[PDB]
DNA sequence: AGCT
DNA sequence: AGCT
DNA sequence: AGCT
DNA sequence: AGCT
């Protein structure tokens, strides 16, 4: 199956698979059972920002999720991604709903990756920035229920015409180009991802969450991965 | 056929298809017969730099080609690319040889494109920078004789084991992601490309040249486009 | 006197010094009497965006001023800045009021300048981006009535405690670092500036405007340059 | 006195002030006695690269120093710079010689700093890149013996016409603009610095080293700070 | 830019 | 490299 | 682009 | 929120 590294914004506690009993952010290394979590004060109907960073010096994957004028949540985990991911990856956003639901609306997404060669000390870099999504966004691979262009946003999961989120939905968007995320012959490598999101639910319990993820290039939504599996994992192992 | 906009670095005068009688840089709009040329003092065996710029305000495609401590060649042409290219494109480098030959070696390639929306005044951007090419460069589409990784360079046309360039060769490299090069609903848009190149010919007269090009996403090398057609055009019309 | 190149967003027609009879954008080369103008449909109380671009290949100074979901105004003028400005400059924003008034509020300002050496083909670059201004913004030189930090904005001209703009006010903000805007030994050079602005007038007719300008490093507000002189020029010559 | 945070490339063991008995890289927090060091295989006469990184999420200052095709040295130290530096700083390079000497030649210097506001989630950024230094580099403050333009390089300490380094020399270069390095109201902040250097000595023991530093804006070379104090500290406390 |  |  |  |  696929190889996944992800930062999850998990709106729904699935205590049966080791979620904490509160909405949380997590670092997922090849499992939906986060290697590290932090409590997250998700604000229903508010636009939030997620920031994810990693470099090959510290080998610490860190995320910050925040809303304007509120305290941020942060989670960090030490991991050598050279030992986890393939050298070449795709990067993407994923989201799901299950019995309970929410909008999984992405208003912006940026990514930057850099590799400096040990042999020449010259740098290879990729950067993309989406502040608006068009109805035909040819540099995004849309999987499952994901759609673009509705008010210039990326709707990862199904929403009705009047903005009501639907249950049992999963969708993802991957950047078209493969990304060279590590190289043994690189002296320094880094990436950063940022996205803005709007999670809104009429349900007393919103579900299930949004994730930024890094995968094998040919990654697809695993069969059955609605709800707690966030469109990333084939099972809850 | 494909739709091509290109900046040619033409090392071989084909006077029978309207080339000037000297090595030259040109702007090619849907024809190998340049809309505009400038004289180019190509320096056999020296690393040079090409810089290509366009924005939606001036709608003037401009190029500068130079070698360190020499005077540059510059060519400009007014063209509304909204009336020539599809909205979504790929960008690439092309080169060819014919009965005369040369190395068509690319040492670096960078590209930046930006679109600012009329409705939100927010910007979408893409940037890539290759200062080294690997043996398996998954974010490049290699066509024809193009190879990567030989001394960390992109060799657009065939070079033998003994290092000598081959005749009748054509090759191209395209960036994997489609590029949104214009949008009627963009208030301002721009792109810039830069590459560094090394053209070496032992065989007296070098041929045929290198081009930076913008094409339909599904562009392929036209069959028989060796020599004066520079891997870009199916004929000399 | 100082040496000024500016893009004016002129909200008040001064027909006695050669303004057109409508609010307009202009290119000012060493005179308040614009070398080129375009009609500008200024929208009282709306946030707008100005984009200014120049490169050493085309030597065409261009500006686009627009509001979301409205048609832009654009103005261009061919000028070799090597023959007008000193090699080293400061860049700034200026605004004024006179017997008529307006808020001259700056919400964001970004600037990028690049110089590529003819001898090495290596690039020197400067970039700054202000999306918020603090009460003590040590990388800005504030002149005249300019203040920062009020709602995170840069107020170029005086606004009273009750929020109403004052007449006969002039103020400017310059970036602290000198900028190398041209070099004879540069093979390619460029700059771009962007700012967002909010011009509000209760007093019927708004005056006088905002300008982006480039000056000698030691530029100061010319004494008496309120009203039609836009904080840039000592007289209307 | 001044407040200094520095990354030292220390070529000369001063065991009397707690240097290790080998050339080393160090993190200096308000003292020449490094809070952390790593062994450094300095290569006399070779061009090296230094990379320094910090962000407000991890609050870990890290450096990597390397030469092409050799193993890098890395040093990291956990420090909350909000508790060390003033909010506004200058950034610079410093170097010294004493009884023993070396060239302290800087071939390139880049710096990037970003602050994201907790209230708006908008970013303020500064970036500069010097790949060549001119004889009159108006955006650098040169202190002590530092000179620019000799072969397009920054010579931090004194060198003769034939390239022979001089003893008892100290010099620094600071970027002209103040830098907003931390803000309590910033949700995420980062900086990165890179420079390339050429340390060459005819002496069996080269001395004394190069440092990247962050200081109070009005920082000057302390009296007597040649040799082991690297132009940064007034004493060896 | 619109009213006298 | 000097000083104990 | 230079030699016959 | 259900299941023990
Ligand atoms: O009355 C509303 C109050 C809050 C309700 C939250 C329940 N608390 C709770 C659960 N229990 C249920 C485990 O989830 C069952 C539903 O499973 C389906 O729906 C979810 C959400 O969409 C999805 O994750 C699943 O995959 C599945 O589709 C806890 O463990 C806990 O805490
Ligand atoms: O100052 C510049 C002088 C350089 C040589 C000028 C022309 N040399 C030349 C020609 N010219 C006729 C056209 O070329 C015929 C050969 O055509 C094949 O080779 C070229 C080069 O690779 C290619 O462009 C064509 O498409 C074709 O493959 C000669 O016959 C000769 O010698
Ligand atoms: O469609 C556009 C119509 C807007 C009003 C047109 C003119 N209005 C106007 C004039 N015109 C004469 C010139 O202005 C005289 C006042 O001058 C002072 O005020 C202006 C504005 O702040 C300033 O530019 C000058 O430098 C001076 O401070 C009137 O007299 C009147 O009413
Ligand atoms: O024959 C050469 C072999 C290597 C010589 C290195 C000495 N080893 C050593 C020292 N001892 C001397 C302490 O430094 C004395 C000189 O001080 C002056 O020169 C240095 C270098 O320029 C400078 O740092 C000082 O500030 C002063 O100007 C150790 O402690 C160690 O190891
Ligand atoms: Ca969950
Ligand atoms: Ca040709
Ligand atoms: Ca006016
Ligand atoms: Ca030392
Ligand atoms: Mn979870
Ligand atoms: Mn041609
Ligand atoms: Mn005017
Ligand atoms: Mn030390």
Give the phi and the psi of residue B231 in degrees, each rounded to 5.
70, 15
Query: Is the Cβ of B41 closer than 8 Å to some Cβ of chain A?
Result: no
Are D159 and D63 in contact, with CB atoms under 8 Å apart? no
Tell me which residue in D123, D130, D178 faces C139 most closely, judged by beta carbons.
D178
- To what resolution in angstroms was this structure determined? 1.7
Could you tell me the distance, in angstroms and rounded to a whole number, from the CA of residue B3 to the centre of ligand 10? 18
Closest C-alpha to D95, from D16, D202, D217, D212:
D212
3-state helix, strand, coil in chain A (%, to 5): 5, 45, 50
Specify the ligand 4 atom closest to the Cα of D96: 22
Residue B216: count of CB within 10 angstroms of its CB: 16
Whether residue D175 and residue C177 make contact (CB cut-off 8 A), yes or no, is yes
Sign of the Cα torsion C132, C136, C142, C147 reads: positive
**How far apart, in Å, are the Cα atoms of A42 and each of A15, A101, A207?**
18, 14, 11
Give the phi and the psi of residue A17 in degrees, each rounded to 5.
-115, 25
Compute the distance between CA of residue B76 and CA of residue B57 in angstroms, rounded to an integer: 15
- Strand pairing of C88-96 and C209-215? antiparallel
Is residue A16 helix, strand or coil?
helix
Sign of the Cα torsion B74, B78, B83, B87 reads: positive
Are B193 and B80 in contact, with CB atoms under 8 Å apart? no
Work out the end-to-end distance of chain D between its first and last CA atoms, rounded to an integer number of angstroms: 13
Compute the distance between CA of residue C202 and CA of residue D179 in angstroms, rounded to an integer: 38
Compute the distance between CA of residue B235 and CA of residue D171 in angstroms, rounded to an integer: 63
For tokens 């109380």, the residue is: C45
Compute the distance between CA of residue B65 and CA of residue B88 in angstroms, rounded to an integer: 27
Are B164 and B95 in contact, with CB atoms under 8 Å apart? no
For residue B150, the cross-strand partners are: B153
In the structure encoding, which two tokens stand for residue C99, read together? Answer: 């017997």
Range of the domain at A53: 1-237
For residue B88, the cross-strand partners are: B180
Are A231 and A215 in contact, with CB atoms under 8 Å apart? no
For tokens 């309207």, the residue is: B18
Q: Is C164 exposed, middle or buried (0-12, 13-18, 19+ CB in 10 A)?
A: middle
Give the phi and the psi of residue D83 in degrees, each rounded to 5.
-95, 0
Are B153 and C100 in contact, with CB atoms under 8 Å apart? no
Is residue B169 helix, strand or coil?
coil
Chain E: positions less than 7 Å from a protein CB are 1
Work out the end-to-end distance of chain A between its first and last CA atoms, rounded to an integer number of angstroms: 13
Please tell me what DSSP assigns to residue D187. Answer: E
- Among all bound ligands, the one having the nearest atom to the CA of D12 is 8
DSSP string, D140-180: EEEEET-EE-GGG-EESS-B-TTS-B-SS-EEEEEESS-EE
Compute the distance between CA of residue C127 and CA of residue C109 in angstroms, rounded to an integer: 11
For residue D129, the cross-strand partners are: C125, D110
CA atoms within 13 A on the CB side of B229: 17
3-state helix, strand, coil in chain C (%, to 5): 5, 45, 50
Q: Is the CB of D204 under 7 A from strand F?
A: yes
Compute the distance between CA of residue A66 and CA of residue A75 in angstroms, rounded to an integer: 12
Compute the distance between CA of residue B116 and CA of residue C176 in angstroms, rounded to an integer: 28
Closest C-alpha to A201, from A60, A86, A68, A43:
A43
Query: Is the Cβ of B150 closer than 8 Å to some Cβ of chain A?
Result: no
Q: What is the 3-state secondary structure (H, E, C) of C53-119?
A: EEECCCCEEEEEEECCCCCCEEEEEECCHHHCCCCEEEEEEEEECCCCCCCCEEEEEEEEEEEEECC
Whether residue A132 and residue B122 make contact (CB cut-off 8 A), yes or no, is yes
Could you tell me the distance, in angstroms and rounded to a whole number, from the CA of residue B167 to the centre of ligand 10? 18
Compute the distance between CA of residue B19 and CA of residue C184 in angstroms, rounded to an integer: 32
Are B203 and B101 in contact, with CB atoms under 8 Å apart? yes
Residue C198: count of CB within 10 angstroms of its CB: 17
Instruction: Give the distance from residue C118's alpha carbon to the nearest chain D alpha carbon, in angstroms.
Output: 11
Closest C-alpha to C23, from C7, C4, C43, C5:
C43
- Cβ contacts of D41 within 8 Å, gap of 6 or more: D23, D67, D70, D71, D73
Tell me which residue in A66, A116, A187 faces D187 most closely, judged by beta carbons.
A66
**How far apart, in Å, are the Cα atoms of D85 and each of C134, D82, D90, D143, D181?**
18, 6, 10, 21, 8
Annotated binding-site positions of A for Ca(2+): 10, 12, 14, 19, 208
Whether residue D207 has its Cβ less than 6 Å from ligand 4: yes
**How far apart, in Å, are the Cα atoms of C47 and each of A208, C42, C44, C66, C108?**
37, 10, 9, 9, 11
Compute the distance between CA of residue D212 and CA of residue D176 in angstroms, rounded to an integer: 15
Residue A90: count of CB within 10 angstroms of its CB: 21
Query: Which technique?
Result: X-ray
Compute the distance between CA of residue D230 and CA of residue D104 in angstroms, rounded to an integer: 11
For B13-20, which contacts have Cβ atoms below 8 Å and span 24 or more sequence positions? B14/B228, B14/B236, B17/B228, B17/B236, B19/B228
- What's the full length of chain D, in residues? 237
For tokens 């304007």, the residue is: A68
For A146-152, which contacts have Cβ atoms below 8 Å and span 24 or more sequence positions? A146/A171, A146/A172, A146/A173, A147/A171, A148/A173, A152/B117, A152/B119, A152/B120
DSSP string, A95-154: EE-SSS----EEEEEEEEEEEEETTT--EEEEEEEESS--SS-TTEEEEET-EE-GGG-E
Are A66 and A194 in contact, with CB atoms under 8 Å apart? no
Closest C-alpha to B213, from B143, B158, B161:
B143
Instruction: Give the distance from residue A127's alpha carbon to the nearest chain D alpha carbon, in angstroms.
Output: 16
Please tell me what DSSP assigns to residue A159. Answer: B
Closest C-alpha to A130, from A154, A94, A96, A113:
A154
Compute the distance between CA of residue D63 and CA of residue D65 in angstroms, rounded to an integer: 7
Closest C-alpha to B66, from B41, B36, B92, B99:
B41
Closest C-alpha to A201, from A173, A170, A167:
A167
Across the B:C interface, residue pairs with CB atoms under 8 Å apart total 66
**How far apart, in Å, are the Cα atoms of B145 and each of A221, B91, B119, C152, C166?**
36, 18, 44, 56, 69
Q: Per DSSP, which regions of B120-220 are E strands?
A: 123-130, 140-144, 147-150, 153-155, 170-175, 179-180, 186-198, 209-215
Are A138 and A204 in contact, with CB atoms under 8 Å apart? no
Compute the distance between CA of residue B142 and CA of residue B172 in angstroms, rounded to an integer: 6
**How far apart, in Å, are the Cα atoms of B137 and each of A83, A197, C231?**
20, 33, 54
Give the phi and the psi of residue A82 in degrees, each rounded to 5.
-60, -25
In the structure encoding, which two tokens stand for residue A156, read together? Answer: 């990862």
Compute the distance between CA of residue B137 and CA of residue A179 in angstroms, rounded to an integer: 10
- Cβ contacts of C73 within 8 Å, gap of 6 or more: C24, C25, C38, C39, C40, C41, C64, C65, C66
> Which residues from chain C sit within 8 angstroms of residue D117, using beta carbons?
131-132, 152
Considering all nucleic acid strands, name the nucleotide whose C1' atom is nearest to the C-alpha of residue B204.
G1
The verdict on whether omega for the bond into residue A208 sits within 30 degrees of 0, i.e. cis, is yes
Give the phi and the psi of residue A43 in degrees, each rounded to 5.
-110, 105
Compute the distance between CA of residue D192 and CA of residue D212 in angstroms, rounded to an integer: 11
Compute the distance between CA of residue B197 and CA of residue B204 in angstroms, rounded to an integer: 19
> Which residues from chain A sit within 8 angstroms of residue B88, using beta carbons?
136, 138
CA max distance for chain B: 57
Considering all nucleic acid strands, name the nucleotide whose C1' atom is nearest to the C-alpha of residue C20.
E1
Considering all nucleic acid strands, name the nucleotide whose C1' atom is nearest to the C-alpha of residue A205.
H1
> Which residues from chain B sit within 8 angstroms of residue C190, using beta carbons?
53
3-state helix, strand, coil in chain B (%, to 5): 5, 45, 50
Compute the distance between CA of residue C90 and CA of residue C176 in angstroms, rounded to an integer: 8
For residue C36, the cross-strand partners are: C27
Compute the distance between CA of residue A27 and CA of residue A212 in angstroms, rounded to an integer: 10
Q: What is the 3-state secondary structure (H, E, C) of C15-69?
A: HHHCCCCCCEEEEEECCCCCCEEEECCCCCCCEEEEEEEEECCCCEEEEEEECCC
Within window 8-27 on C, which residues have Cβ closer than 7 Å to strand E? 13, 21-23
**How far apart, in Å, are the Cα atoms of C109 and each of A107, C49, C128, C153, C158?**
23, 10, 8, 10, 19
3-state helix, strand, coil in chain D (%, to 5): 5, 45, 50
Compute the distance between CA of residue D226 and CA of residue D104 in angstroms, rounded to an integer: 13
Are C189 and C82 in contact, with CB atoms under 8 Å apart? no
- The count of domains in chain B is 1
Mutate to test the interface with A, among D47, D72, D118, D120 (most CBs of A within 10 A): D118
Q: Is A45 exposed, middle or buried (0-12, 13-18, 19+ CB in 10 A)?
A: exposed
The verdict on whether omega for the bond into residue B178 sits within 30 degrees of 0, i.e. cis, is no
Whether residue A57 and residue D53 make contact (CB cut-off 8 A), yes or no, is yes
- Cβ contacts of C188 within 8 Å, gap of 6 or more: B51, B64, C55, C56, C57, C114, C116
Residue B78: count of CB within 10 angstroms of its CB: 11
Compute the distance between CA of residue B192 and CA of residue A130 in angstroms, rounded to an integer: 19
Closest C-alpha to B109, from B160, B168, B173, B66:
B173
In the structure encoding, which two tokens stand for residue A7, read together? Answer: 């930062």
For tokens 């290949």, the residue is: C57
Whether residue A20 has its Cβ less than 6 Å from ligand 1: no
Please tell me what DSSP assigns to residue A219. Answer: -
Compute the distance between CA of residue B117 and CA of residue B56 in angstroms, rounded to an integer: 13
Compute the distance between CA of residue D234 and CA of residue D221 in angstroms, rounded to an integer: 8
Compute the distance between CA of residue A169 and CA of residue A164 in angstroms, rounded to an integer: 13
């Amino acid at each position: 199956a696929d190889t996944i590294v992800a930062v999850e914004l998990d709106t729904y506690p699935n205590t049966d698979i080791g979620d904490p009993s509160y909405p949380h952010i997590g670092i997922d290394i090849k499992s939906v059972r986060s290697k590290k979590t932090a409590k997250w004060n998700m604000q229903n109907g508010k636009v939030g920002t997620a920031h994810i960073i990693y470099n090959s010096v510290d080998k610490r994957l860190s995320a910050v999720v925040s809303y304007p004028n509120a305290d941020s949540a942060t989670v960090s985990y030490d991991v050598d991604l050279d030992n986890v991911l393939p050298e070449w990856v795709r990067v993407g956003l994923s989201a799901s709903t299950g019995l309970y639901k929410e909008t999984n609306t992405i208003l912006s997404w940026s990514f930057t990756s850099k590799l400096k060669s040990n042999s020449t000390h010259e740098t290879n870099a990729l950067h993309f920035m989406f502040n608006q999504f068009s109805k035909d966004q040819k540099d995004l691979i849309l999987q499952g229920d994901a759609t673009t262009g509705t008010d210039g946003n990326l709707e990862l999961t199904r929403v009705s015409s009047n903005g009501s989120p639907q249950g049992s939905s999963v969708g993802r968007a991957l950047f078209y180009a493969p990304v060279h995320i590590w190289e043994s012959s690189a002296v320094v490598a880094s990436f950063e991802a940022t996205f803005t999101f709007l999670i809104k639910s009429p349900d007393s319990h919103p579900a299930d969450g949004i994730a930024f993820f890094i995968s094998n290039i040919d990654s697809s939504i695993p069969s059955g991965s609605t709800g707690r599996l966030l469109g990333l994992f084939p099972d809850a192992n």
